[PDB]
Amino acid sequence: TGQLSAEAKAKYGESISSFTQYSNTHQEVRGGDGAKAHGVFSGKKEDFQAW
Amino acid sequence: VDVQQNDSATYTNVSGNTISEYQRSLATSVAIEGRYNFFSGSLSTDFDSN
């Protein structure tokens, strides 16, 4: 007559996340007038038409 | 004075975005029992780290 119980438990967790985003854009316009030329950078047709 | 037309435009855009994430978890548990006809013993230990 003797009783013994023993338990050991271990849990481990590791989690790693990484995100990276990079953008580059370059636009150039020649001719017309420079003020309307800047308008094409909107990408909007009416402003492209105005240039 | 000589003036020349030069109507021109240039645009540049550079952008960078970054996320980094690290996570850790640790859990531990211990349970012990002792027995004798006129004695009983119990021990518990629990540990958690985040």
Residue numbers in the entry:
A (entry chain E): 233 to 283
B (entry chain F): 82 to 131
Q: What do the authors report?
A:
Mpf2Ba1 is a 53.2 kDa protein isolated from Pseudomonas monteilii through a multi-step purification process informed by artificial diet bioactivity screening against WCR larvae. The protein is comprised of two domains—an N-terminal MACPF domain and a C-terminal β-prism domain. Pore-forming proteins (PFPs) are a major class of soluble proteins that oligomerize into rings and undergo large irreversible conformational changes to become transmembrane assemblies and breach the membrane of target cells. We have identified and characterized the non-Bt insecticidal protein Mpf2Ba1, providing mechanistic details for how it effectively kills the devastating maize pest WCR by forming pores in midgut membranes targeting a different binding site than the insecticidal proteins currently deployed in commercial transgenic maize hybrids.
We were able to convert Mpf2Ba1 pre-pores into pores by either introducing lipids, in the form of POPC and 4% cholesterol mixed liposomes, or by raising the incubation temperature between ~50–53 °C without adding lipids. Although heating is not the physiological trigger, it appears to catalyze the refolding of the α-helical TMHs into β-hairpins to form a β-barrel, which has higher thermal stability than the helical conformation, confirming that pre-pore-to-pore conversion is endothermic. The 2D classes of the pore showed a distribution of stoichiometries, ranging from 21- to 24-fold, demonstrating heterogeneity of oligomerization. It was also evident that Mpf2Ba1 pores dimerized tail-to-tail: the barrel of one pore was inserted inside the other, and the inner and outer pore had different stoichiometries (3D classes in red and blue). Despite the most common stoichiometry in the 2D classes being a 22-mer, the inner ring of each dimer showed a consistent 21-fold symmetry and a clear structure, while the outer ring was a mixture of 22-fold and higher symmetries. Therefore, we decided to refine the 3D structure of the inner 21-mer pore, which was determined at 2.6 Å resolution and revealed a pore with an outer diameter of 240 Å, β-barrel diameter of 135 Å, and a height of 120 Å, increased by 40 Å from the pre-pore conformation. In the pore conformation, the β-sheet at the MACPF core straightens by an average dihedral angle of 36° to allow the helical bundles to refold into membrane-spanning β-hairpins and collectively form a β-barrel. The straightening of the MACPF central β-sheet repositions the HTH, which is pushed ~8 Å towards the lumen of the pore, restricting the diameter locally from 135 to 110 Å. This shift brings the HTH in close lateral contact with residues of the neighboring subunit, where Phe273 contacts Tyr92 on β1-strand in a π-π interaction, and the side-chain nitrogen of His270 forms a H-bond with the oxygen of Gln145 on β2-strand.
